[model samples]
Target: ATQTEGELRVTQILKEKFPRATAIKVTDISGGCGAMYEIKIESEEFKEKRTVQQHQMVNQALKEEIKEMHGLRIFTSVPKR
Candidate 1:
């Protein structure tokens, strides 16, 4: 179940985009025809970036995927200070 194509792509994209990230986790949340997915990303890249900026970073990373996805929820976390 974890080796699905979409999941693989998501993981690859996250890693490529945020190599310095502490951790990243992605969940399908539901079996919905590849139209929707949930992504949870934790990284220092988000430490100073605003919420909208963080979202934009996710959007940029998933630009190709977003074109096909109908909905997406991205949760970003930063390391504790």
Candidate 2:
């Protein structure tokens, strides 16, 4: 639960978007510049969505936030169970 405000801020948005997500992680890989981010999420919402579509879902969720970032790396998956 302890995390940098930048990463944690994104995590908060992800959690809200993926309320049923089994796993979610967000990291600021920009080395404190807050210029880039790495994101991971596993959720039922990705059930039949393609990888690109899954990413699109996340992008849509953070469209506002994304506009300010320099880069993003997104990893998404549907729950195995």
Candidate 3:
């Protein structure tokens, strides 16, 4: 992974946030300028948090927990409670 100045900053930010993560790859594939970033990460934090639940009955019970979660959900169907 080739990280430039901007990418490096992003990498540090991600690393600081996901301390338990592994293989944090931050690359600048946005031509020459670092206007964009491509990040690859694998972590325990992402998995269990992504695994969501159910039947509308369970959603209302976990609003606070979900609110503190990552915004871009991978494969979850979290709805407004």
Candidate 4:
């Protein structure tokens, strides 16, 4: 798939996992091969979670996709008050 398609798929997967997410951004860091993705996410679900927990949630959400990726960089945060 193309990078844009991969990014869209990533966004869809995350949104499915966190329906109330306030923000989601996926970047194709590997140019256009869909090999690598950088993600930034903001959500209320992460409010009381530790950073590792937040990352775990994302990892779980993308479990199958991760297998196909060359690399992934994730930045997760709770929504600002």
Off by over 4 Å in 2: 1-4, 68-70
Which digits, one per residue and each the tens of the lDDT, describe model 2 over residues 1-81?
A: 234577776777888999979989887777756667888899987988999999988877777765653488899999876
Tens digits of per-residue lDDT for model 1 on 56-76?
A: 888788777656445678888
Least accurate 10 contiguous residues by lDDT in model 4:
61-70
lDDT by residue (tens digit), candidate 4, 11-67:
788888988788887888777566778888888889889998998888788777655
lDDT string, candidate 3, 1-81, tens digits: 345675565556666655665555555665565455454555554443444432122223222323212322222222222
Give the distance in Å from residue 2's predicted Cα in candidate 3 to where it truly belongs.
Answer: 5.9
Q: What's the TM-score of every candidate structure?
A: 0.79, 0.82, 0.51, 0.79
* Model 1 misplacement above 4 A: 1-4, 65-70
- Supply the TM-score for candidate 2: 0.82
In the predicted model 1, the residue pairs found to clash are: none
Q: How many backbone clashes does candidate 2 have?
A: 0
- Per-prediction RMSD in angstroms? 2.3, 2.7, 10.9, 2.7
TM-score of 1: 0.79
